[PDB]
């Protein structure tokens, strides 16, 4: 029986300040009881002043983000390099995620 999922540990955190925001996340990456790398980032700037991190199953994470970033790219292409309002961003991420409602991305994402 082929099981398409895996957990690569990790923890991320996001606090919203009065006029700034942070998003942290350790760099360790694991598999069961072993180490895969002591430094493998899980927190990226996606452009338009938006940080994002998807934590859970390593691969679904990389996928979502890439998929999100390629999406910011086209939002500009179609609306005159207009800036992506972080709220407008979350709404968009929803559709991305719900896109796979029946073969879900095994991750907890945070922008």
């Amino acid at each position: 029986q082929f099981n398409p999922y895996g957990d690569n540990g990790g923890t991320i955190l996001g606090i919203a300040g009065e006029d700034f925001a942070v998003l942290a996340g350790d760099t360790r990456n694991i598999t069961d009881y072993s180490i895969n790398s002591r430094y493998e980032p899980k927190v990226f700037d996606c452009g338009d002043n938006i940080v994002m991190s998807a934590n859970g199953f390593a691969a679904d994470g990389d996928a979502l983000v890439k998929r999100f970033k390629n999406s910011v790219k086209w939002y500009h292409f179609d609306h005159n390099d207009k800036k992506l309002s972080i709220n407008s961003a979350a709404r968009n991420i929803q559709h991305l995620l719900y896109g796979k409602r029946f073969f879900p991305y095994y991750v907890h994402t945070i922008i």
Binding site: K66, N70, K73, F77
Partner: protein, 234 residues
């Protein structure tokens, strides 16, 4: 008497081996405004003369981005260009996500040729009525190309297309030895392009409302200068 039973469809060869419908297409590129492109060994440049309707309407742009390192200017039927420039944006994105390598300019030519291709060999349609000058900066430095609706993409050093484009091409053909060497300095490569374009004006002169410019190179991601910002060249 005196008909031409060989120009009804893109799918018919005249007795001499000519595709008239395609020819008429180019003719529509001649009827459009002018645009110029020229490059050195560190940058490429697009200079275009936007046109308009009333003193109330806006000037229709003709420079289009495609990636951080690529773009083009157009002449002719606006819509066709949209489709083309768009197909291009797609091709670059694929070559970016999948392989993670910036699409080389020559490749973008082949691609725009093979797509324009299909429309000269099948029944029912018509050929794209629009010419484009593409510019970019891959791993072989600067790059300039000139595509025509027949699927003929040629890589130049400079050029212009559009009504009266002639004069500007002439100019570029002389000042060549001069600009091909304008390296490290963008401000001069553009002043050159602007000179060359003026060789094609007859009605008015370029004002801040109808002038468009664009550059890309070594440490300059494809950016477009519009209106109030191109003033230092007028």
């Amino acid at each position: 008497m005196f008909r031409n039973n060989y120009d009804g469809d893109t799918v018919t060869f005249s007795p001499t081996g000519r595709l008239f419908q395609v020819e008429y297409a180019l003719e529509a590129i001649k009827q459009g405004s002018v645009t110029v492109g020229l490059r050195s060994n560190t940058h490429a440049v697009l200079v275009a003369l936007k046109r308009n309707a009333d003193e109330l309407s806006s000037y229709q742009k003709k420079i289009i981005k495609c990636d951080e390192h690529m773009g083009l200017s157009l002449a002719g039927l606006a819509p066709d260009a949209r489709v083309l420039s768009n197909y291009l944006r797609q091709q670059c994105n694929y070559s970016s996500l999948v392989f993670n390598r910036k699409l080389a300019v020559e490749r973008a030519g082949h691609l725009l040729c093979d797509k324009a291709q299909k429309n000269t060999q099948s029944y029912g349609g018509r050929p794209y009525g629009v010419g484009l000058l593409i510019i970019g900066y891959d791993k072989s430095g600067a790059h300039l190309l000139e595509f025509q609706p027949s699927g003929n993409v040629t890589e130049l050093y400079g050029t212009a297309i559009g009504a009266r484009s002639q004069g500007a091409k002439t100019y570029l053909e002389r000042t060549l030895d001069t600009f091909i060497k304008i390296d490290g300095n963008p401000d001069e490569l553009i002043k050159a392009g602007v000179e060359a374009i003026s060789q094609s004006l007859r009605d008015e002169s370029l004002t801040v409302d109808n002038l468009s410019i664009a550059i890309v190179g070594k440490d300059t991601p494809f950016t477009i200068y519009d209106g109030e910002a191109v003033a230092k060249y007028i």
